[PDB]
């Protein structure tokens, strides 16, 4: 095809030197220093294709062995989301489904089973558990919860989140799913303590709870899958759930820059998903008449997040390639190690918006020291 295509490419992507290497054997290193990272092409992958998504083209490529990578993947697309010239970046490059469940997550998630950003501190570095304990208390703090009030967790996930409320900070707790085998962890209110009086767990959509409504609402997760036509619909209803003066806490993956899906993401990872705008969540906030109290960016540990999760992956890849493909393992790793650069890069964030049903901050103290542990 073209050399000239693939030189142009390649030579705009990068804020570090790369080595290259083509189909036909021949080399070249792009930029000065010593190259971290060298990017072999196995096959030639056609310029149209790249040309109409380079993420579609070149992630299955790497995931066919037909593009191989020495060096960081996460350090690659960290590079490209820093480029504006890149093949993630340009509009130049912008014109299957796999057998998974409970045995797979076990095996790299931590011991809680969070599929979800987690909170560092100061003091741990890479304690997964720890930080996915110290999420949920950095979320729960933030309501300034009241001994006896009621919450509502929208998409309750395995319940860490529900039972430390109803534990730690003496709250009447509503969970929700529409997954059976997280339901099934209603086993957990029977033997932890029949927690029967402090928290029930319901298998339904959110989207009708009927007239139902709670002192506070926290929603983790959960507007990434909405999509853009259903934004303002979603905020709707955690207003709807909320008393008067009521406290929510929603969480989510949010892009700076503006609302996007990724058509690789959305092929093989989450079909469907949409990473929306920060201007476009506070409109969906506002026109749901909630006032936003306070806005913190956790960028930086998801990014944390995924890379120990990674690691994790990667840790148990002789296990995970018995069961699953080669190619899955690829793609898996790529999914893993290409959203960690995402967040690295400042390209997506990670944001808990403190909203009021009235007057911003309104039940709340008027200052922020309550937050921190």
């Known amino acids: 095809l073209e050399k000239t295509f693939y030189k142009m490419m390649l030579s705009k992507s990068f804020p570090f030197p790369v080595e290259v290497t083509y189909?036909?054997?021949?080399?070249?290193?792009?930029?000065?220093?010593?190259?971290?990272?060298?990017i072999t092409f196995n096959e030639k992958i056609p310029m149209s294709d790249i040309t109409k998504n380079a993420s579609l083209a070149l992630g299955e490529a790497y995931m066919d062995k037909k593009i191989?990578?020495?060096?960081?993947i996460q350090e690659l697309i960290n590079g490209a989301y820093?480029?504006?010239?890149?093949?993630?970046?340009?509009?130049?490059?912008?014109?299957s489904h796999y057998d998974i469940g409970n045995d797979f997550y076990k095996l790299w998630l931590d011991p809680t089973m969070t599929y979800s950003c987690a909170y560092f501190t100061d003091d741990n570095k890479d304690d997964l558990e720890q930080a996915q304990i110290a999420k949920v208390h950095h979320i729960l703090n933030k309501l300034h919860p009241e001994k006896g009030k009621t919450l509502l967790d929208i998409g309750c996930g395995w319940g860490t989140?529900?039972?430390?409320?109803?534990?730690?900070?003496?709250?009447?707790?509503?969970?929700?799913?529409?997954s059976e085998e997280q339901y099934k962890l209603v086993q957990k209110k029977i033997y932890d303590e029949g927690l029967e009086d402090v928290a029930e767990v319901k298998l339904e959509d959110y989207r009708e709870l009927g007239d139902q409504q709670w002192d506070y609402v926290t929603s983790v997760g959960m507007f990434e899958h909405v999509g853009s036509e259903n934004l303002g619909e979603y905020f709707k209803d955690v207003a709807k759930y909320l008393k008067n003066d009521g406290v929510a806490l929603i969480h989510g993956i949010t892009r700076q820059q503006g609302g996007a899906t990724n058509a690789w993401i959305n092929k093989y990872i989450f079909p469907g998903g949409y990473i929306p705008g920060l201007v476009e969540i506070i409109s969906r906030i506002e026109e749901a008449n909630l006032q936003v109290s306070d806005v913190e960016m956790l960028r930086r540990?998801?990014?944390?997040?995924?890379?120990i999760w990674?690691?994790?992956?990667?840790?148990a890849r002789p296990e995970i390639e018995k069961n699953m493909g080669e190619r899955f393992c690829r793609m898996w790793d790529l999914y893993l190690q290409a959203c960690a650069a995402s967040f690295e890069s400042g390209n997506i964030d990670v944001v808990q918006y403190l909203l009021t049903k009235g007057p911003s901050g309104k039940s709340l103290p008027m200052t922020r020291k309550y937050m921190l542990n």
């Open 23 to 38: 189909w036909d054997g021949k080399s070249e290193v792009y930029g000065n220093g010593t190259p971290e990272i060298h």
């Open 68 to 72: 191989e990578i020495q060096g960081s």
């Open 82 to 95: 820093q480029s504006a010239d890149s093949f993630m970046r340009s509009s130049k490059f912008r014109k």
């Open 161 to 178: 989140l529900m039972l430390t409320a109803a534990k730690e900070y003496g709250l009447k707790v509503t969970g929700v799913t529409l």
């Open 301 to 307: 540990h998801y990014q944390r997040t995924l890379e």
């Open 310 to 315: 990674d690691k994790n992956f990667n840790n």
